[PDB]
Structure formats: C-alpha cells, structure tokens
C-alpha cells in the first residue's frame, strides 16, 4: 500500500513564515489519519467541517496542506468568521470552510537564546484579504497624504516585523507550529482515499 | 487625520517597544542574580539602546495636536508617550547622571564597618548588621553599629547626593515641571471626565488632613512602648524624654516589629510568633511558597506559571557567586514573571512571600492591556494589593488552620489584644517615618533647606514629629538620609504612606463582600470567591481608567479615608488610654541625652 506523504509535512526542520505560507498539493495517496495522533500532545485538535472522529472511509479529490508558525495567542484566530490581525492580512479561511486545523507547541526546537528573527508576519496590508491569497510583496505602506516613494519615514512604514522567539516567554507568546487541511470534492475522479 | 494617523503609529510603536525593552530587563535580571564584569557592560548597553529608541519615539509622537480629537484610550496612550521625562537631557547631563547613579549603587552595595576591638573582622549590612540590629541586646554594641554605619556610608554620599539633586531639579525644570518633587507628585493627577478630576497641588493638603486624625493614636502607642522599655535598659532610658534612635528594632527604625517580645503584654499565653513552630515542623522555601500559592488559589486567583518555579531564585545562592538580597518581584515582559528573594525560615519572610506574590498577581492581572497602559493605576496600589493578603494570612485562625498553632488553642481576649498590638507595632510605627521622609525630600527638591541646615531641619522635624532622639550629634558634614536604600536608589516613598490607608479600605470592602460578620480584625477572607472576583475586576483595569474610578469600582469612594483604619484599631485605643493612667504622654526637643 502506497502511504501518503504526511511525515514530510508534519516532521520538518524548518517551516515557513506567516505572511508566506507553504502550500502543498497532495493527491494520489492513501490518507492514513491515525498516524496524526502518533505525535500525541496537541494544543488544539477540535476541528471544523467533519465529525470529531475522522471517518477514514471518505474519498476526496486533491487535498491542500499548508503550514506556518505563529504565537500561542493567535492559534484561536485560525477559524472561519474570525477577524483580527492575522486573519485579515496574513491568512483567511472561507466562511463555508471544509477541513480543519492542527496545532502543537514547539519551544525546544525553534526558539534559541538571544532570539531568532527568521519568523516574520505582515501588518498594515491596506485591505482585508480574500480567502487563500498570499501577497508576498513588501512595499512601504502609506499612512496619510504624502507620496513616500520607497523611503520609510515620517508616517510611512515597513509592513513586516519579526517575532524574535526566546525561551521563557510563557505559553502566551511561545512558538506554536500550525498545519491545516482543506478538503476538496470538485467533480472529477476521487483519488485521495 | 490625527486619530487614524496616530492609531497606526501606536500599532508600530507597541510591537517594537515590547521587544526592545525585554532585553534590558533580561540583562538587568542576569546582572542582579549574578554579579560579574561582563553583565554590567551588557546592562549598560541594553539600557542605552532602549533610551535612544524611546527618545526618538517620544520626539516623533510629540507633534500630534490633541486639541479635541481621538478616543480616550488613544489620548491616554499618546499623552503617556509624549510626556518624555528623563530623556530630555543632553548627552553630557545624561552620562553624568548615569555615572552618579552607578557610583551611588556601588557605594551603597558594599558598605562595611569593623569591630573596634577586632579590626580584622569587618561586616557588611546584609549578613552582619541586620542580625545585630534585630537581636542584639547590648545598648553600647547597638550604638556602636549605628554610629559605624552612619559614619562610613554617610561620608561618601553627600557630594553625590548634592550633584544628583541638582541634576534632577534641572531635568524636571526642562520637562515643563516645577521641580522633581512635582515630577513625583504628578502621578496622582487624574483627568478623564467631570467628577473624576484631581490636581497635583491637592495631594499635599490631603496628607495632613489624615495625619492629625492619626496623630493621637500614635502618641498613646509611643508612650506605652517607652514605659515598657524603661525596665529593658533601666539606666539607658529617660522617661521624661524621647526614645533612642538606635533601639528601634532596625538600623533606622522603619518597622518596630522586633520590639514586640520587649513590649508584649502577656507572657503566659502561647506566643503568636510562630518562628519556633516553623523551624521545628520542618519547613523550607518551597513549602512556604506553596502555602502562599494555596491562599491565592482558595481566594479564586490564577495559579503560578510553570516558568515561575523553574526561573525564580527564592533562596540564597551559596555557591560562589554574589547576588543582591533585596526582595523584588520581576516582570521581565512577554509573559515572564520571576521573584528574587533570599528566604529564611522565619515569619517576616513568610509575610514577605505573600507580599511579593501579591505583586506578581497584580502584574499578571493586567497582561492584556496595551503596552503603554500596562501599569498600576497609581504608585500607591501595588503595596496595598500586596498587604491586603498578608492581613488575612496573619490571623491566628489562619495560623491554626494550617496546623502551625496547637489544635487545642483557644482564642480569648488575650489573643485578639496581642494580635492587634503586634499589627499596630508595624503598621502605625512606619507612618510617621514615611511622612517625615517624603516631606523632607520634597522640601529638599523644592530647595527650601540649605546645605548647612539639612541635618538641623531633619533632626528638628524628627524630634517634633516622630519623637525619637539621637545618642550623639551627627555633624552637618554627613548625610544621614542618604543611608537608606530608597533614598540612595531614588525611589518614591509616599506610596508607603498611601498603602497604609488603601489597604484598610480594601480590607473592609472585601470583608463586607465576603459575607463576614464581627470585628474587622478577624476577617480571614479564604475559600470565598466573591472577594476574589471583586478584587480582580479592578486589578484587570491596569492604567486604562483614572485612579478615582479604579478606587470607586471597589470601595464606592473617591478619596482617602481613615475611618476603616480607625475601625480596625478601635479595640487598642481604649486599652492604651486605660493602661496609660500614670503616663507622661509627650516628648520635647530640649531634652537631649548627650551633654550640650
Ligand atoms: C555568572 O556570570 C559569569 C560571567 O558574567 C558566567 O561565566 C561565563 O558564563 C558565560 C555564559 O555561557 C560563558 O562564557 C562561561 O560559562 C563563563 N565564562 C568563563 C570564562 O568561564 C557564569 O557562568 C555566570 N553564572 C551562572 C550560574 O550562569
Ligand atoms: C521526526 O523525525 C525525527 C528525526 O528525523 C525522528 O526522531 C522522529 O521519530 C520523527 N517523528 C515521527 C516519526 O513521528
């Protein structure tokens, strides 16, 4: 039996930043969701769309799995119909979302003494995101009525800032790796079973 | 735009200040818990970075009008950012002030005196003089220690204090304030609505409006102790006179708690001082702090964080590193809370644990407020919040519940009287000291006392206000007030006067809310979530609303009130009056024990 590549998306040395999440199209595989609990400690596994028990006897088309790393305060913002600073400018989910989310704590793996600034998030996007839009572009954000032409000063700002994770922050401001799954059944033959 | 243009600026500022201020706190904690040469330089650089960034942000924020614009929250945040303060000085003045403060700290940290009979043995204050001032029963030896500490450190702080006060008044004048005393007093200015108004000028007139009503309560307490101390050192006491300044239970006499065994009414009843029981039953620092945490859990307050236990000091390090044993509660930032304290198996440390954990709880309460408002409502609330828990934890009923007191113990007229006397010796004894110190420092900062009359005015007001006399005249060349930690480290002291009233007000409110009935001094709010919620609903406010509204939300008042304190200390006033039937109540300036 051809297993489905979940270990290489759940077990990675480095995830991606919040503002540029790493989408992965998964198709033509045998989805074994029981190995998800093999990790064990999950901050939140209650998840939307389907029943608590996964109902492995469900055949879908291609499934998308995109992951990132956020704080512990913003884990609750990954939900349909939820607003805030991260669900408006970085990652938005549809109101009729099918599929659900997984999150767990990781502080002894991606948080080093002296702070690591490789994790960045977007602020001041000038317009709330539509579902599944990335906007990697980094141009200074205008705040006022003066034409700043690429120089950040006065009332013109840079949209990206660093988390700067260090150990001993407490659960609130401590790294939390998040991976989400979106299930699609848009006609066509069913492959992911 | 103004409003929407300032919201964006505040959003930018918050999540950059929150990261550039954590490093300074971490470096300071590392230096304090481990004294070396690298840590001092790291702290010095981390402070400079934050100072420069704060200066730039304040300059940027100053030009935002605020005539009639914005919401109240934005207005409060932006005015707090604009007020600047210590960063409105040039580099020359800044570096001079920094090196003056560093030299103050270095002199005060490692002050030493030596035994006249044995010159080799020279002792510090923390392990060497604290024990002497606490337990030593030799009058001449106590006078020796007092004179040595006043003669060593007092020599080395006078010019430093002169330069420091000069620079502070100059900085306050540059900050659009009258003086640095007004800078200190500006914390009580509340202006958020009509009715919720306060002025910087009105604080001083409220002080004596509550001192005079407490003055005759202290006179009967001062006289009774002096008559009790007549027999302790029969030759070395003048009943027709004041009290010696060194036989006050400490180096200066801040707390008269050590005088309780020398002033106890009853000697037959079981002693409420449970240090012996704590030593015998096998307690340690972990047990003390777990017992302290159980009280807050029972009241209905959050548990201690996991990192608190793994990061707090809580004990002397021994080992081979030097630390600072001044108790503190640390809020490093980003959700990190730690406590530094050199605990010992006594009762003073048992209550200090409750005090510091109350500080920690209040810090935890307002973690969700914005960065510029993550503060107490005013400087006099942290101490009251800390002490309203020790008040409930010190009662004999609570002591008997945890098994410290015998299970056959019986409360009577003796127990209540002794408990009230012990509490009064601490609470009442510190108010004159606090008032005198803060008033004297305010006159100094206003420049009303010349350098040739500092000691004269200090001792004259001490004699006519507190009523304690000196064994030998200290010449004006010294600097007596600088010998205190708060004076040498530039800490506000009127908070220690406002606590002694806010704590009683909050205690009475919590007793009323907890459905308790009886006398005030047997409250013991425990296992009652009503008081916990009533306290938390105001603790969580932080600095978002004026201190008048913050007080009203719990008490239903809008200013200071001595009536709860008088209610608490009612059963002692009558007894003191009746027992002082043959008392010479009154002290005089003219009587000085030494010749001339
Ligand atoms: C107390 O501080 C000293 C120096 O400030 C520490 O000694 C150094 O610590 C750093 C930190 O990793 C390392 O270079 C070495 O461990 C030490 N240097 C040398 C040359 O030995 C000391 O470790 C600190 N104490 C504690 C308990 O952390
Ligand atoms: C993840 O990878 C590490 C090292 O490659 C391995 O030790 C661990 O068992 C893996 N986790 C799994 C297979 O759940």
Residue numbers in the entry:
A (entry chain B): 333 to 525
B (entry chain A): 20 to 615
What does the paper say about this structure?
The Omicron subvariants BA.4 and BA.5 that were the principal variants during an infection wave in the summer of 2022 also share the L452Q/R mutation. Additionally, BA.4 and BA.5 has gained an additional immunity evading F486V mutation, and the reversion of R493 back to the wild-type Q493. The structure of the mACE2/BA.4/5 complex show crucial changes at patch 1, where the BA.4/5 mutation F486V loses Van der Waals interactions with adjacent mACE2 residues F83 and F28 compared to BA.1. Q493 on the Spike RBD also no longer forms interactions with mACE2 due to the loss of the longer favorable arginine side-chain. The hACE2/BA.4/5 complex confirms this loss of hydrophobic contacts for F486V mutation with hACE2 residues F28 and Y83, as seen with mACE2/BA.4/5, however, Q493 now reestablishes a hydrogen bond interaction with hACE2 K31 residue, an interaction previously first lost with the appearance of the Omicron lineage due to the charge repulsion between R498 and K31. The combination of these two mutations allows for the BA.4/5 Spike to maintain high affinity interactions with both hACE2 and mACE2. Importantly, binding to mACE2 was unaffected even with the loss of two interactions. The hACE2/BA.4/5 complex is very similar to the mACE2/BA.4/5 complex with an overall RMSD of 0.6 Å. The Spike protein from the more recent Omicron BA.2.12.1 and BA.4/5 variants, containing respectively 1 and 3 mutations in the RBD compared to BA.2, retain a strong affinity for mACE2.
